[PDB]
Write a protein that binds this DNA or RNA. Structure first.
Lengths: 72, 63, 69, 41, 139, 136, 175, 55, 183, 114, 60, 89
RNA sequence: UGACGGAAGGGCACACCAGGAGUGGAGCCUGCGGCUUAAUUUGACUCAACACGGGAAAACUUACCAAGACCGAACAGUAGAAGGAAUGACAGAUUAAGAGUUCUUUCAUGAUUUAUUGGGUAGUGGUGCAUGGCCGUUCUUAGUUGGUGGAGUGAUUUGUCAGGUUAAUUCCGGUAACGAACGAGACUGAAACCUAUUAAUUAGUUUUCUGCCUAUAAGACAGAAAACUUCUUAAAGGGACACAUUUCAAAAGAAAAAGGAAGCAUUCAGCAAUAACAGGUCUGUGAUGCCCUUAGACAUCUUGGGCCGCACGCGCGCUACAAUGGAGUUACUAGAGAGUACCGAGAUUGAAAUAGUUAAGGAAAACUCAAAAGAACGUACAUGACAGGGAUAAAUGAUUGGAAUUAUUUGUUUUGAACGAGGAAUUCCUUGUAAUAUCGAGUCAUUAACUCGAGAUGAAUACGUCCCUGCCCUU
């Protein structure tokens, strides 16, 4: 079997991994979701961009809101 | 506005109700243009029959 | 690399009360500061422990104006 | 401008300069060493 | 020091030359085509097919399941025919697919369900020919 | 050896190699030049001047008779030729003649592309506000 | 230097990294050190290293060091041909010779520091090679090679020698 | 009829067939990750969604 | 009869069975933002003051998609000013009353910014500050709670921004803090 | 008997395996004398089984240098600095992050006034 | 034909913009302290060269 | 006619290879009925032999530029003979 | 009190110096002005307008133009009216139009609404000199303030300073000031390390079995299996604070050197005060005030065109002017991205190429997804607008789309232009940085010479001063 947990908060999946624990918590590489946008609503002004990013942590094990768990 | 007779009661029979503001497409439930639903019951809010809160290009009707 | 008054005053306040606990070794002072003053950041703890040790060299050699232990 | 002819330290450049021959022919004489330069003595 | 186990122990360029003359019917488009679309001149080498056939065959020796496309990007160049900055493009398919088809006729290569692989005797002749160039290299 | 040859009433240079001396013909470029060398079976590396007029009468024949000399149709500068015939036959000073009459054919019927040739403007529809600014 | 290969001027020996320490002598002039992070740190770079990095200029040759390492290797062999001496030994005489010992600054005549003497010695020899080999039959390595050997003893036809004499003369009248 | 030709033009390719979720304007869209939220509207609600101005 | 063929479905992207992980959380975040702003317009008279997926709807949710710290809550506090401002109360007294409510409710510091046409036809903006408040740092990403509201008057729209600095209960501590204990 | 060691450059990683043998060095299966950029052969040479899986082509030449240098120490310690310090310590320098308003890390686009 | 001069200490840096260093030199031949202006990166331990030593460079 | 389009340009036979649109077939159907000038907005027709004798006006942007079809004005687009701008002064 | 000084004193910034790359000169892509047209929509015009409105416009977007239609006239009252208010319509004519728009014609459905007065409503219409919000700027440097106290009738001032030091009103110090708050710092993300911990798949290594191949004796490859964690991924910890030596300044600190993965706050970023502009946006918004238009519409929709129009001027860029190169063949090497019913597209096969017919796996460390600059190979090219340059054009071949003409993009042949390193001026830059060549993503039915990111080769010149442009303190 395979228990997979993916969440936006690192302390979330880490807390639930240790609570379920048993095969070790494997850590699939983190995904970053980068979005770059112009700050201004119109064109006027200096060319300024702001950098947004949301992370996604994935843990898979084999035997709170924002955390999802699936059993294969 | 001019609407089919079998159509107007279908909205009223169904009536909460929601409808997109995009007029190009049809309503997924009744299979009728979103225009007819909008204009038929935009007139119903003036009679104080419902509430016409608008949010994210969708109109939510709740009296 | 000067030190702000939030770490010079914090370093002073520890020494007046807790002189004997501290010593000339920098690495011991790191361990004490985590226990004798609740600092939530490792970097801030080292800077205070850095200055607290630095004050000992002057204190050991003689009296200093700011600190009266 | 030079019209250095086409038919009939050692480098194909110098043996093309004062021999007044094109550097393509200068390869032929030196034959009768690397794919970047031909240095002979 | 040095020893021989496979084709990785001989320099790539002089093995393909060594495996060139050893090699395959010549089609009618041998002298009328280039090896891609980015290029603009047909190969200057009269026997460019054989020097290409050895390289394509050698690439099979190292990649277990290899296809036409993986060769097309391998024998590909840059496209800078305008003022736009050059962007890499695929090589030619028919020249490489035909040559790979010809190696099937000899039996050097085979057909796996996800590409092509060298046969048993294809390993032999490749290993055999890679040896004299190895011996010649040491001397 | 001659520094000045003549083929299809067009003067070439004898210093260049045979494929890069046949580009002096108006209808022949670089890819076409190499092909006729292979069809005629001459040595590319040998210079044009050294090459005997025995081969000249065939190269000019090949340049004017390529269709029956095993030349792919997609190699021809004039495919689906109008005015009868469906072959290039444009390796001559005939390059200008066909080009000149194609515009006049367009210009006769007042085609828009033809009209853009009359005014001497950009023909293939490109921005002309800032580029192509030859003063007049 | 390539498995094949003294400073008279007492003012450059300490700033010339040739053989005072073992970290200088190297089979290739391709060392990836950080020689430009502190003042007076480039003096740790081998002399052949410094010359190679000046063969990597004029925009379209930016970053091509293996390209510039090949031409220098072929140049040194030709240098040994023309002088029957060590190309490294031959080059370091050129730096001593092709170094302007005075300069004019707004004018006003002032001397030139020894470290600036080395920088300008390679910079002047570098430009002559670039100009001579541009749109010319001679291969870049050859053009660099005879430039150095000419600049070695006294030859005026060398570009660096021409420039040194011009600037030295200007400073002389600028006093 | 009165509406037979109304909105009879097919818009399936999309530059006037895609709309921002809330603003509804057709310029400046962000179709990445299926957001369908154009700029000047995603910036306001970015923190609510979960995106943060990290580096 | 109409010549329309398109159909914009009244579905949601959080109910999709086959969805990528990158697409899953983006849709989860977007749906929360859409839902949060939906009932904010409904529960304005009640102070919805937050949603998780207030200070006699479900049918709307299916059709469309197929607090003791009242002082510390910025959303409900901001609505208090909007209600009072629209009631004709002067901005100085009404905002002053709300600030005293927060200050005695256990907040380290708060600030209300009112900008608009308060004085006359020419625009003006007043800022009220009470208590300690840091403006720069990553700390304000955890020690802040703000809401942006706009009220409509007879001469225009007035913008009211209410922000409140929280305390240690949102677990953590500020940057500069030594608080040396004694023996 | 064997030890494991590795060396790093900008992004080049060369994981070596120092082990008893007849002295044959091989990188990814090819002999050390048949390195692709033949100019760099003498720089690499300033029973091992090295595997290079990163960087470019000059980065891996320096990474291989570390792998051979580090392997001798690791093998000898368990069972260089006066010449080149970077033989045993990785160069910390990495590519900087591009920022908006410029084509590089510090370069900025041209300005106009009139 | 030229006479060398060791560098003792740096007086500072002058010449409008900072690109000319005022240094004090002691000629090893005649242990004479001579003040000059230097163009370029210099250090105390450096040894200069001089083709002329009669210009007591002071800038008034 | 399906045979003639083969010897035309690559674009011409492709735009004919796709199924005939209703507007174009409803256009040539009028072309057979009429010759009397016929106006149209359709600047997308390919000149085919079935309309050689027709006199047709093409909406440029505001008017109708009457053009009489010539056998020498083949598969080029029908919209190339109605300019959409006064050229230059 | 502030502002200003062709006033002084002290500091700072690629501001300049020492330089690199340049732009300006040529062709082309793009924006702006101008002229033209029916329209060539419009905002912005010193830094703080001009590859900017994420603005790469065939249709839509779309705001402009020529036509055509059209209500998106609620609600309330009247008239009319199931013996019909009205709506839709095949055929002919009209119309580009298969808009029944209208007319000849009768056939369907039925108060869903026609004419009516008020009245709202609608608008990419105006007004950013009526506003909110957002953003830029002053201003990326170090500045700002109130509680009590001292001085002045008062605006106000001290606190917020002599000196030194610092990246920093950061500190040592000084003191009618004392005690504070914001700003800096502190803080967050990435990079620079862990042979110690935790783990092992979809990462990797090792070992073993089976088959095959060559050597002189080691190994290679393929198909399996089941172990370890150096690499890889990534959680918690640890790890540098200039501690510590020498010198310099009883003090804050400064400068080598050694050690270290890491020593300019270690580097790059993020957040970033008080006060202010009547700086940009009502053309992002169902956020909005007032005015304007409101059945012959400035609302809406359809068709066609335009934003691409060229006598010239300016800004951002790409390609070039070659031998440190171009053309042909060979081996190669990454990083960060993206992916559904349909998206990213493997393998087979048709051919000269773009591309076509079938077609696995993959909601992904699993499948697709793949490097060129540079390198090596030849008795190739030899300095000549040459094979440098690839504009301009002529033929033809395919894709996307309802549609490719005013070329969407692209293939084959042919065509072979200016351009011989660029005047006054002017921009960016201090270390894995500049530069060079390339890859991914945004936009995306189809379209990058743009922008946002990613690696790959890796320079030169400084360790300084206010001379220019400018800041910030003090008389």
């Amino acid at each position: 079997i395979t228990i997979t947990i993916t969440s936006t908060k690192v302390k979330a999946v880490e807390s639930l991994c240790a609570e379920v624990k048993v095969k070790g918590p494997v850590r699939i590489p983190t995904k970053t979701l980068r979005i770059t946008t112009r700050k201004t609503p119109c064109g006027e002004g200096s060319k300024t961009w702001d950098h947004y990013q949301m992370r996604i942590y994935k843990r898979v094990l084999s035997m709170e809101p924002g955390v999802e768990l699936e059993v294969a | 506005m001019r609407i089919a007779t079998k159509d107007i009661i279908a909205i009223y029979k169904q009536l909460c109700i929601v409808c997109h503001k995009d007029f190009v497409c049809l309503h997924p439930v009744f299979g009728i243009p979103n225009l007819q639903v909008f204009m038929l019951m935009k007139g119903l809010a003036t009679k104080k029959c419902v509430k016409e809160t608008c949010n994210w290009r969708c109109l939510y009707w709740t009296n | 690399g000067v030190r702000t008054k939030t770490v010079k005053r914090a370093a002073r306040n520890i020494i007046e009360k807790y002189y004997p606990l501290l010593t000339l070794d920098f690495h011991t002072n790191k361990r004490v500061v985590d226990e004798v003053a609740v600092v939530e950041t490792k970097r801030l703890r080292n800077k205070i422990a850095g200055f607290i040790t630095h004050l000992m060299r002057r204190i050991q050699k003689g009296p200093v104006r700011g600190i009266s232990f | 401008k030079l019209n250095n002819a086409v038919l009939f330290v050692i480098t194909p450049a110098v043996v093309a300069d004062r021999m007044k021959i094109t550097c393509s022919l200068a390869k032929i004489l030196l034959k009768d060493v690397d794919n970047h330069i031909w240095i002979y003595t | 020091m040095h020893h021989f186990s496979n084709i990785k122990d001989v320099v790539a360029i002089d093995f393909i030359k060594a495996y060139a003359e050893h090699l395959l019917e010549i089609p009618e488009w041998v002298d009328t085509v280039k090896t891609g679309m980015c290029k603009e001149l047909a190969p200057l080498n009269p026997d460019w097919i054989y020097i290409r056939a050895a390289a394509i065959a050698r690439k099979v020796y190292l990649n277990n399941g290899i296809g036409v496309m993986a060769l097309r990007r391998a024998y590909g160049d840059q496209y800078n025919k305008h003022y736009n900055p050059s962007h890499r493009t695929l090589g030619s398919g028919k020249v490489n697919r035909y040559i790979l088809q010809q190696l099937e006729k000899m039996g050097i290569v085979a057909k796996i369900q996800s590409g092509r692989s060298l046969t048993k005797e294809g390993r032999k002749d490749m290993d055999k020919i890679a040896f004299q160039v190895y011996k010649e290299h040491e001397a | 050896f001659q520094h000045m040859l003549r083929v299809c009433n067009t003067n070439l240079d004898g210093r260049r190699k045979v494929p890069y001396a046949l580009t002096g013909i108006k209808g022949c470029g670089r890819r076409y030049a190499y092909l006729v060398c292979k069809r005629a079976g001459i040595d590319v590396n040998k210079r044009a001047g050294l090459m005997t007029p025995a081969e000249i009468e065939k190269i000019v024949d090949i340049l004017n008779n390529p269709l029956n000399y095993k030349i792919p149709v997609w190699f021809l500068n004039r495919q689906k030729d109008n005015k009868d015939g469906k072959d290039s036959q444009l390796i001559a000073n005939a390059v200008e003649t066909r080009l000149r009459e194609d515009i006049e054919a367009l210009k006769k019927m007042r085609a828009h592309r033809g009209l853009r040739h009359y005014w001497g403007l950009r023909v293939r529809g490109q921005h002309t506000k800032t580029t192509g600014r030859r003063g007049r | 230097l390539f498995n094949k290969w003294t400073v008279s001027d007492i003012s450059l020996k300490e700033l010339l990294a040739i053989n005072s320490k073992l970290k200088y002598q190297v089979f290739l002039p391709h060392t990836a050190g950080r020689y430009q992070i502190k003042p007076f740190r480039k003096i740790q770079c081998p002399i052949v290293e410094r010359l190679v990095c000046c063969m990597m200029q004029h925009g379209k040759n930016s970053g091509k060091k293996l390209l510039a390492m090949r031409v220098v290797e072929e140049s040194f062999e030709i240098i040994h041909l023309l002088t029957e001496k060590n190309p490294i030994q031959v080059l370091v005489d050129a730096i001593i010779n092709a170094s302007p010992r005075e300069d004019s600054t707004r004018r006003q005549a002032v001397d030139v520091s020894p470290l600036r003497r080395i920088n300008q010695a390679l910079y002047l020899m570098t430009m002559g090679c670039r100009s001579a080999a541009f749109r010319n039959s001679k291969t870049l390595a050859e053009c660099l090679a005879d430039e150095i050997v000419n600049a070695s003893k006294s030859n005026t036809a060398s570009f660096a020698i021409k420039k040194k004499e011009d600037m030295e003369r200007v400073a002389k009248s600028n006093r | 009829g009165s509406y037979s030709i109304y909105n009879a033009h097919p818009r399936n390719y999309g530059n006037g067939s895609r709309t921002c979720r809330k603003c509804g304007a057709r310029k400046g869209l962000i179709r990445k990750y299926g957001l369908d939220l154009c700029r000047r509207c995603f910036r306001e609600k970015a923190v609510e969604i979960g995106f943060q101005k990290l580096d | 009869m109409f010549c329309l063929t398109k159909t914009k479905a009244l579905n949601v992207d959080v109910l999709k069975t086959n969805i990528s992980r990158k697409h899953k959380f983006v849709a989860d975040g977007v749906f929360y933002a859409e839902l949060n702003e939906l009932l904010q317009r409904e529960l304005s008279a009640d102070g919805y003051s937050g949603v998780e997926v207030a200070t006699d709807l479900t049918n709307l949710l299916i059709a469309r998609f197929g607090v003791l710290a009242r002082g510390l809550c910025p959303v409900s506090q901001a609505e208090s000013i909007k209600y009072k401002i629209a009631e004709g109360l002067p901005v100085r007294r009404a905002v002053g009353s709300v600030m005293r409510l927060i200050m005695d409710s256990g907040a380290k510091g708060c600030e209300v910014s009112i900008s608009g046409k308060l004085r006359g036809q020419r625009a003006q903006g007043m800022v009220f500050k009470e208590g300690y408040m840091i403006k720069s740092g990553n700390a304000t990403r955890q020690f802040y709670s703000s809401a942006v509201r706009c009220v409509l008057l007879r001469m225009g729209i007035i913008g009211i921004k209410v922000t409140i600095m929280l305390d240690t209960d949102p677990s953590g501590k500020n940057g500069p803090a030594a608080r040396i204990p004694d023996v | 008997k064997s030890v494991q060691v590795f060396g790093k450059k900008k992004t080049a990683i060369a994981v070596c395996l120092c082990k008893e043998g007849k002295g044959m060095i091989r990188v990814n299966g090819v002999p050390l004398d048949l390195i692709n950029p033949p100019v760099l052969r003498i720089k690499v040479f300033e029973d091992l089984k090295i595997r290079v899986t990163g960087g470019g082509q000059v980065a891996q030449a320096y990474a291989i240098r570390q792998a051979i240098a580090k392997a001798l120490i690791a093998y000898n310690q368990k069972f260089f600095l006066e010449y080149d310090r970077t033989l045993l310590v990785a160069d910390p320098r990495r590519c900087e992050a591009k920022k908006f308003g410029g084509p590089g890390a510090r370069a900025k686009y041209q300005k106009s006034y009139r | 034909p030229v006479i060398y001069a060791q560098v003792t200490e740096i007086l500072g840096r002058t010449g409008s913009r900072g690109g000319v260093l005022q240094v004090r030199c002691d000629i090893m031949g005649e242990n004479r302290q001579i003040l000059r202006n230097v163009k370029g990166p210099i250090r105390v331990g450096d040894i200069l060269t001089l083709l002329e030593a009669e210009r007591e460079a002071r800038r008034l | 006619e399906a045979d003639f389009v083969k010897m035309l340009d690559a674009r011409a036979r492709r735009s004919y290879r796709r199924s005939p649109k209703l507007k174009h077939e409803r256009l040539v159907k009028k072309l057979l009925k009429i010759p009397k000038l016929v106006k149209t907005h359709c600047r997308d027709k390919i000149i085919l032999p079935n309309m050689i004798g027709s006199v047709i006006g093409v909406y440029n942007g505001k008017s109708f530029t009457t053009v009489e079809i010539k056998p020498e004005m083949l598969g080029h687009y029908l919209g190339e003979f109605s300019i959409t701008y006064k050229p230059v002064t």
